[PDB]
Amino acid sequence: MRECISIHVGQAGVQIGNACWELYCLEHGIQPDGQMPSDKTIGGGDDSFNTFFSETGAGKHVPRAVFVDLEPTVIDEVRTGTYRQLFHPEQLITGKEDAANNYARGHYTIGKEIIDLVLDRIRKLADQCTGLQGFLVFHSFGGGTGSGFTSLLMERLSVDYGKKSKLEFSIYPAPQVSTAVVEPYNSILTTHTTLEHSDCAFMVDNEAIYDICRRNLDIERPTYTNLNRLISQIVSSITASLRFDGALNVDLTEFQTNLVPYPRIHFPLATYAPVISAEKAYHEQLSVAEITNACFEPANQMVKCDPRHGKYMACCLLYRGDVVPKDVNAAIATIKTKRSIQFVDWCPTGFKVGINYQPPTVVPGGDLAKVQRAVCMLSNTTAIAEAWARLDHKFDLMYAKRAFVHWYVGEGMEEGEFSEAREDMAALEKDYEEVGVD
Amino acid sequence: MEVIELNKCTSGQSFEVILKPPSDPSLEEIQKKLEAAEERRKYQEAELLKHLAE
Amino acid sequence: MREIVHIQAGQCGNQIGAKFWEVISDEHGIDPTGSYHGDSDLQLERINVYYNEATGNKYVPRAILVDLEPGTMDSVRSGPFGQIFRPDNFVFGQSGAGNNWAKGHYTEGAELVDSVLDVVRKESESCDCLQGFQLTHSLGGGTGSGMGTLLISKIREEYPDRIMNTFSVMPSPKVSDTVVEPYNATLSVHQLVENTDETYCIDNEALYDICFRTLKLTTPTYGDLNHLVSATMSGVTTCLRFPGQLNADLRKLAVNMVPFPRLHFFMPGFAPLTSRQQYRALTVPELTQQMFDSKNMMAACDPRHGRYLTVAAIFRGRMSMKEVDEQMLNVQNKNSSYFVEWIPNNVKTAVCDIPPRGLKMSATFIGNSTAIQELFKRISEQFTAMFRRKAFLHWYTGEGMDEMEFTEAESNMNDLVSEYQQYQD
Amino acid sequence: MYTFVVRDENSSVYAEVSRLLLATGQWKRLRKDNPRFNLMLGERNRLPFGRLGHEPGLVQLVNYYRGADKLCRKASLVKLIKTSPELSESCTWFPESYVIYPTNLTDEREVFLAAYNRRREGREGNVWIAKSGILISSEASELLDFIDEQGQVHVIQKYLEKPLLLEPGHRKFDIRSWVLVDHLYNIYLYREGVLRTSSEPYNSANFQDKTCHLTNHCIQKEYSKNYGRYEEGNEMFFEEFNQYLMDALNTTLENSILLQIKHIIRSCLMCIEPAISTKHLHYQSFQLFGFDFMVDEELKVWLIEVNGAPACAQKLYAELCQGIVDVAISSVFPLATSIFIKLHH
Ligand SMILES: Nc1nc2c(ncn2[C@@H]2O[C@H](COP(=O)(O)OP(=O)(O)OP(=O)(O)O)[C@@H](O)[C@H]2O)c(=O)[nH]1
Ligand SMILES: Nc1ncnc2c1ncn2[C@@H]1O[C@H](COP(=O)(O)OP(=O)(O)CP(=O)(O)O)[C@@H](O)[C@H]1O
Ligand SMILES: Nc1nc2c(ncn2[C@@H]2O[C@H](COP(=O)(O)OP(=O)(O)O)[C@@H](O)[C@H]2O)c(=O)[nH]1
Ligand SMILES: [Ca+2]
Ligand SMILES: [Ca+2]
Ligand SMILES: [Ca+2]
Ligand SMILES: [Mg+2]
Ligand SMILES: [Mg+2]
Ligand SMILES: [Mg+2]
Known part of the structure; x- marks a missing residue:
């Protein structure tokens, strides 16, 4: 068992982190107070879920996570929220004033004065791991902290943990839910200095999440709460292989080996299906073929773009729920004959498939409907x-x-x-x- | 249409299907970046205070 | 705990400042004695941004009242909410400034500035994390204009990294007290171009035209004009006073509104403006049309005469937020020639559920338009008409000023106009 | 009040559409770099499709289908027809063609030579044509040598040695059909077509003088000496052509030729529909196509090429361009006896 430490930088990273750990706890049966009745090894254990949760002598399961924000407003929501008991205070780091949507302010001015503190706290979680795999960094492109301080933190992590893998979940800026005109500057500044330090980054375009919520969930004006619960479902599907028994994407290195043949081209496209509204009185359950087919529709991609006019370098299918291999291959055959799927010549034309029998968990009172089977497709498209x-x-x-x-x-x-x-x-x-x- | 590496466990299974075959800055250098930026901030502020003192 | 320190200087500055605190105190449930009697927790959410908390759960505004004569501030201390202001935060002299920028900046004002800065320092020392400062003043008189800009210069010397924000009343011959207002205004603008991050330009002419043509007030008074400035000040500070991360920070608003350091002069606006057909509901489309109509703006500048660098819009009340976006996008997409195309998505919209007193909903407009150059064009014309004959200069040379200082201020303001003109093309 | 931008100033077609849009008083033209547009009349090359459909509150439309070049590129069309089961290598209405790369650079040089030698041995007509500057020859040595002297990909296809000849004149010709595909992928064929005729007698004993073999309006109006003799501008319209087919051949343009044309248009466009359709896309596409056809003496119709940025006959700009506004633009941005024939799916 090798541990994974999650780092959430800035407002977007922190609020998305809150949504994910809320989900992880529901998925692993962990109560808000950290207790886990199903865990029969008290105080310890090398189970699959222990890659994300450590255990105290009292049987509390504590996330291997660090929350960092240059202003305290968002992290104070965690300190007094439903899952206030999950984390100990050392895991929640807040400054006095933020980066004001300014990359240089977060990277240089404020970053220089809090960088060593964040590493020390991260060092504390690292010292609890018998075999640390690497880190998962959640952050926005547009925020001054998400952009500026993340890029600095990535540089230092490569210094203090050279042989470790670093994956990103980055929020791509979208005007419909943004009030900062300089986010294009911050996005390019942070991608430049972070590029050589990230092994695999999953970009989530807020424009895509926003439209999926309006279209599939019939939310007239989606909030951050609506957006983040959906994003945490995708994140959960991507990290499930690390938290449950399995044989595909079992450690962070496998994400690079399976999805990134060339180091700079490390931005896989994520596509998720199905997204059903809980307010829907009547819903017909989709089949393996139908949800697999939906993985090639632009309307359910995390980034709007046309893979028909790009080339594929890799392709992973991560199913959750009632799915057997027989139905997957049948759907793949039918999709190859009907879809525009062009692989580069120096790559095999295939699909690595993963099936977890436990269907997607939905937060009580959330916007998503409980479906019997879902799939997240990770493909490295030039599109x-x-x-x-x-x-x-x-x-x-x-x-x-x-x-x-x-x-x-x-x-x-x-x-x-x-x-x-x-x-x-x-x-x-x-x-x-x-x-x-x- | 071939299937390979079928792994099965109690919580799920994974496999692969092949349709067709094919054809850093050191700790020191970072300190310089930060301290260099801090110096340029100190220079701009000194010029401001010089202007104000005049 | 992102505290702001409020400073109000001079006759105009203190009468407009007095009404502002009266308006927002009401929105936060604070009564004239500083006691909170509201019914919503949103009122106290960000209450410490503008108020200190004293014993007995009393809330005291973080405001410093400055003037070189006692008159106006005695009226405040005897006014509606006069008892609410910290007694120690009244700093005033007896000489006066005689509507003379040099007296407020160099002679009379210089004798009083240190004691004002002693109060500013005391307020900053109790701020957990000071955002910056906001100053209300006029540019046409002597204290608010001359001493106001002296204070900014000294505050900037002691707090060089804090945001400096002003509400500046621009003089107009149509609502004038003395002929030397262009002199005082041109000298102040010279200071403001260099030492403020954000200045809301409030033209007394626009305020008059609105009171006459729109509000249908036969004989408007300064009090009638100040009602508009209060309502406007309350709207532009909604982002700061209530929970919401739209333009919630004083420094974030500057980053999103100021593409070039010198072009930080804004046209404020407010809708609705209704004459006493005053109970009618206003639909979101109506709010948006009016908020962008020149007749609802207070810089006396037609936006159609220039282009928008950046725009911030705030909507207050319970309304269709979907309908808000639809209408905000309809305005940009129907007049896209009035927005510069080299700042993508330069119109940002914020919403707040709590509307102003006695309104189901409203909208405040904050525009950084190159059309503001016409405001400085007027001041510059009036200035030069007198300065070519050296008319009325003896009032200033008598305080130690030289003609050179007038020439430099004029050149810098004319350069400012030329910079608005180059980005308009 | 809808808005649009223009990014191809050299387009005679959409210059008229741009002129009509403003005539309705309900459309406004923006600078070519302004992104707040409903309609883009984009450039021919490197059209930035990736920046379309990302403006909140604007339904955006563009006058080109991303990926249509697979149909409008000489080499691409050859590859598409051979590799697409919908068209198959046994496609009967397209001349036998091979993609040939210059030796200074897959390639079908050997595959072509095999078919060539087969014809040379079977006493059959072995006259091919090369194009990408055109060369017609009956010797394989000349065709390949002409391609190597160039530096771009070329295509060699069989030359229709038995072309249908109009009379009097004994002259060749090709048919141009304008086809419009809307955002919903309905295929509309303009009721008006043109014949680009050769003003010279066809002579199968001299492929050196290419003026009686190439029916291009540019070659006829520059190198031919009988320009504008039989018809004004070497352009015969359907009305006259159909009357001819009745007088000389006792048949109609619809039965003898048009049915085959419609079948060819359908087959080509329905084939690439999965690849270029904007049905479930964040932006919408439409496009005007120019199909060029040949007719042999057996009244069989052959497909020559497909033009992605076609011009129009001067006499047909008004009707066609208006029809482009009605079915392609106003169908997405409504305003305050169709001229097309629906062959869609
Ligand atoms: N999907 C999603 N996006 C968010 C969320 N919160 C903020 N964003 C996006 O993040 C961008 C702004 O960056 P932030 O993360 O809020 O800023 P920051 O990282 O805290 O840095 P500061 O400038 O110091 O505040 C905008 O594009 C927002 O749309 C969130 O909870 N979910
Ligand atoms: N296989 C073939 N047999 C006989 N003639 C042919 C032929 N292929 C092309 N042609 C002749 O060539 C002319 C068309 O040339 P082509 O269209 O390939 O060049 P081009 O694309 O530069 C002109 P345009 O695009 O405007 O039609 C026609 O007039 C036709 O007579
Ligand atoms: N809007 C408004 N303008 C005022 C008020 N009082 C004065 N002015 C304007 O301010 C200028 C005079 O400056 P004033 O504030 O009286 O001088 P000071 O007391 O020395 O700062 C003139 O342009 C007046 O029109 C007021 O109460 N409201
Ligand atoms: Ca255990
Ligand atoms: Ca590394
Ligand atoms: Ca004195
Ligand atoms: Mg923040
Ligand atoms: Mg006065
Ligand atoms: Mg052509």
């Missing part, structure tokens, strides 16, 4: 580069006038870092085009 193109375009419009640059320079960052980080994205876009287009 995800559309998200970089959009972002880079907005960067170019503002930077051509040096709009807002003075806020970053005033925090001690050199203007040259803008163009440096932008040329790296230009290369990332070219690498995608070299692999995908002919």
